[PDB]
Design an enzyme around this catalytic site. Structure first.
Site, PDB file in Angstrom:
ATOM      1  N   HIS B  42      22.106   8.373  51.651  1.00 40.01           N
ATOM      2  CA  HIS B  42      21.508   9.520  51.988  1.00 40.01           C
ATOM      3  C   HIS B  42      20.500   8.917  53.312  1.00 40.01           C
ATOM      4  O   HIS B  42      20.019   9.800  54.161  1.00 40.01           O
ATOM      5  CB  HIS B  42      20.227   9.745  50.836  1.00 40.01           C
ATOM      6  CG  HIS B  42      18.951   8.953  50.707  1.00 40.01           C
ATOM      7  ND1 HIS B  42      19.029   7.984  49.978  1.00 40.01           N
ATOM      8  CD2 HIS B  42      17.992   8.822  51.419  1.00 40.01           C
ATOM      9  CE1 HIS B  42      17.763   7.355  49.952  1.00 40.01           C
ATOM     10  NE2 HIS B  42      17.062   8.048  50.881  1.00 40.01           N
ATOM     11  N   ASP B  88      24.748   6.960  45.797  1.00 42.67           N
ATOM     12  CA  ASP B  88      23.791   6.712  46.982  1.00 42.67           C
ATOM     13  C   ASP B  88      23.962   5.306  47.543  1.00 42.67           C
ATOM     14  O   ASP B  88      23.342   4.491  47.273  1.00 42.67           O
ATOM     15  CB  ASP B  88      22.607   7.027  46.532  1.00 42.67           C
ATOM     16  CG  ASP B  88      21.388   7.289  47.892  1.00 42.67           C
ATOM     17  OD1 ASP B  88      22.033   7.537  48.948  1.00 42.67           O
ATOM     18  OD2 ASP B  88      20.339   7.168  47.694  1.00 42.67           O
ATOM     19  N   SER B 185      13.773   3.161  51.393  1.00 42.99           N
ATOM     20  CA  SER B 185      14.993   3.429  50.885  1.00 42.99           C
ATOM     21  C   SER B 185      16.091   2.927  51.680  1.00 42.99           C
ATOM     22  O   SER B 185      16.185   2.503  52.808  1.00 42.99           O
ATOM     23  CB  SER B 185      15.141   5.058  51.244  1.00 42.99           C
ATOM     24  OG  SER B 185      13.922   5.563  51.119  1.00 42.99           O
ATOM     25  N   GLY B 186      17.479   2.534  50.958  1.00 47.10           N
ATOM     26  CA  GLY B 186      18.448   1.994  51.351  1.00 47.10           C
ATOM     27  C   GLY B 186      18.302   0.435  51.209  1.00 47.10           C
ATOM     28  O   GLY B 186      19.420  -0.524  51.324  1.00 47.10           O
TER      29      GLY B 186
HETATM   30  C1  LIG Z   1       6.481  12.082  49.462  1.00 43.10           C
HETATM   31  S1  LIG Z   1       7.060  11.095  50.331  1.00 43.10           S
HETATM   32  O1  LIG Z   1       6.319   9.916  50.789  1.00 43.10           O
HETATM   33  O2  LIG Z   1       7.470  11.779  51.912  1.00 43.10           O
HETATM   34  N1  LIG Z   1       8.599  10.773  49.674  1.00 43.10           N
HETATM   35  C2  LIG Z   1       8.349   9.708  48.520  1.00 43.10           C
HETATM   36  C3  LIG Z   1       9.832  10.047  47.858  1.00 43.10           C
HETATM   37  C4  LIG Z   1      10.557   8.690  47.550  1.00 43.10           C
HETATM   38  O3  LIG Z   1      11.876   8.576  47.868  1.00 43.10           O
HETATM   39  N2  LIG Z   1      10.062   7.890  46.687  1.00 43.10           N
HETATM   40  C5  LIG Z   1      10.541   6.709  46.136  1.00 43.10           C
HETATM   41  C6  LIG Z   1       9.942   5.788  45.180  1.00 43.10           C
HETATM   42  C7  LIG Z   1      10.616   4.786  44.731  1.00 43.10           C
HETATM   43  C8  LIG Z   1      11.735   4.431  45.196  1.00 43.10           C
HETATM   44 CL1  LIG Z   1      12.497   3.205  44.437  1.00 43.10          CL
HETATM   45  C9  LIG Z   1      12.631   5.077  46.339  1.00 43.10           C
HETATM   46  C10 LIG Z   1      11.834   6.254  46.852  1.00 43.10           C
HETATM   47  C11 LIG Z   1      10.541  10.800  48.788  1.00 43.10           C
HETATM   48  C12 LIG Z   1      11.959  11.673  48.147  1.00 43.10           C
HETATM   49  O4  LIG Z   1      12.113  12.872  48.753  1.00 43.10           O
HETATM   50  N3  LIG Z   1      12.351  11.602  47.067  1.00 43.10           N
HETATM   51  C13 LIG Z   1      13.228  12.180  46.346  1.00 43.10           C
HETATM   52  C14 LIG Z   1      12.947  12.877  45.203  1.00 43.10           C
HETATM   53  C15 LIG Z   1      14.004  13.473  44.287  1.00 43.10           C
HETATM   54  C16 LIG Z   1      15.392  13.198  45.018  1.00 43.10           C
HETATM   55  N4  LIG Z   1      16.339  13.767  44.241  1.00 43.10           N
HETATM   56  C17 LIG Z   1      17.053  13.062  43.193  1.00 43.10           C
HETATM   57  C18 LIG Z   1      17.853  13.379  42.405  1.00 43.10           C
HETATM   58  C19 LIG Z   1      18.407  14.875  42.680  1.00 43.10           C
HETATM   59  C20 LIG Z   1      17.958  15.538  43.780  1.00 43.10           C
HETATM   60  C21 LIG Z   1      16.996  15.046  44.650  1.00 43.10           C
HETATM   61  O5  LIG Z   1      16.562  15.595  45.763  1.00 43.10           O
HETATM   62  C22 LIG Z   1      15.729  12.816  46.253  1.00 43.10           C
HETATM   63  C23 LIG Z   1      14.702  12.365  47.029  1.00 43.10           C
HETATM   64  F1  LIG Z   1      14.782  11.886  48.002  1.00 43.10           F
HETATM   65  C24 LIG Z   1       9.666  11.609  49.577  1.00 43.10           C
END
Ligand SMILES: CS(=O)(=O)N1C[C@H](C(=O)Nc2ccc(Cl)cc2)[C@@H](C(=O)Nc2ccc(-n3ccccc3=O)cc2F)C1
Ligand SMILES: [Ca+2]
Ligand code: NA
Lengths: 44, 234
Positions: B42, B88, B185-186
């Site tokens: 992603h 991913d 992420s990544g």
């Molecule tokens: C508010 S933010 O600070 O701007 N930010 C924090 C969230 C994050 O990434 N936290 C985060 C927390 C912990 C870890 Cl380990 C990695 C990321 C991120 C997000 O967009 N997350 C997210 C949520 C859901 C899905 N998803 C899952 C399944 C199906 C469809 C679907 O869209 C995909 C995603 F990208 C937005």
């Protein structure tokens, strides 16, 4: 292998190691072949 | 990273940072070898063009060891889709080889069956990155690391608004305010076995960051060890 990882330093009775490592004489420990083996934090 | 601590010198050498045209970090990566970086599929969508920086611990100061690498080939998993965030994972082949040194070294790739029974069963793993230090806050200028407990798959599914697939695993805390976040992420999720760190996950997604009742979701690297091996052999 289900016990103490077969006494293996890395992969498990037959021990093995990741790339950049060689199984030691004792056949359990793993020896890095370079100064920057994978998975080891670095020191000066 | 929300909570956690700054990595000390040499502590998170496998960390890589993807930088966009603005020379700003937007995703992490894990060094796998002198030519390959492991990251999330992603992340490839978030910047038309990007480069990879290794050895950096402070984005506001240029210090010995930092180096930039251009990406020669991007290998994104063909089944990744934003609809599910499943599969991913991506591997980047760099144009020129990374020189390992202090703060720049690869994480080890474990053997599948062994990882499944011995690494994934450990109590915790370590996640690191330059991401946001709070859900609505700014990205960290310093490389941070966080110890995250593996979370039971069923507990995770119950807590999640989205489907957790077998290509994912959960880690982190129910209510404690510590978690990875956007920008991380990544990046790497590694698990120590005795004295060696094996890459076990790729920071993938989460509902918010450190939200009560939510966990961090990671791509389960064991499900893709063969894919990575094939990818690394061009
Ligand atoms: C508010 S933010 O600070 O701007 N930010 C924090 C969230 C994050 O990434 N936290 C985060 C927390 C912990 C870890 Cl380990 C990695 C990321 C991120 C997000 O967009 N997350 C997210 C949520 C859901 C899905 N998803 C899952 C399944 C199906 C469809 C679907 O869209 C995909 C995603 F990208 C937005
Ligand atoms: Ca720096
Ligand atoms: Na939480």
């Amino acid at each position: 292998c289900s016990l103490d990882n077969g006494d293996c330093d890395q992969f498990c009775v037959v021990c093995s190691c990741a790339r950049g490592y060689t199984l030691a004489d004792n056949g359990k420990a793993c020896i890095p072949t370079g100064p920057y083996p994978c998975g080891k934090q670095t020191l000066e | 990273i929300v909570g956690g601590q700054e990595c000390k010198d040499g502590e998170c050498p496998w960390q890589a940072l993807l930088i966009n045209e603005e020379n700003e970090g937007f995703c992490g990566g894990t060094i796998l070898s002198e030519f390959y970086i492991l990251t999330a599929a992603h992340c490839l969508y978030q910047a038309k063009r990007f480069k990879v920086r290794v050895g950096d611990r402070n984005t506001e100061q240029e210090e010995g060891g930092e180096a930039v690498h251009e990406v020669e080939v991007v290998i994104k998993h063909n089944r990744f889709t934003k609809e599910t965030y499943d599969f991913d994972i991506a591997v980047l082949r760099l144009k020129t080889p990374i020189t390992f040194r202090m703060n720049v070294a690869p994480a080890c790739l474990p053997e599948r069956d062994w990882a499944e029974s011995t690494l994934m069963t450990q109590k915790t793993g370590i996640v690191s990155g330059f991401g946001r230090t709070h859900e609505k806050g700014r990205q960290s200028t310093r490389l941070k690391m966080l110890e995250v407990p593996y979370v039971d798959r069923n507990s995770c599914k119950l807590s999640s608004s989205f489907i957790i697939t077998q290509n994912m695993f959960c880690a982190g805390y129910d209510t404690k305010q510590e978690d990875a976040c956007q920008g991380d992420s990544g990046g790497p999720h590694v698990t120590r076995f005795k004295d060696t760190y094996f890459v076990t996950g790729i920071v993938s997604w989460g509902e918010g960051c450190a939200r009560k009742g939510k966990y961090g979701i990671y791509t389960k690297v064991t499900a893709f060890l063969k894919w990575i091996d094939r990818s690394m052999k061009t």
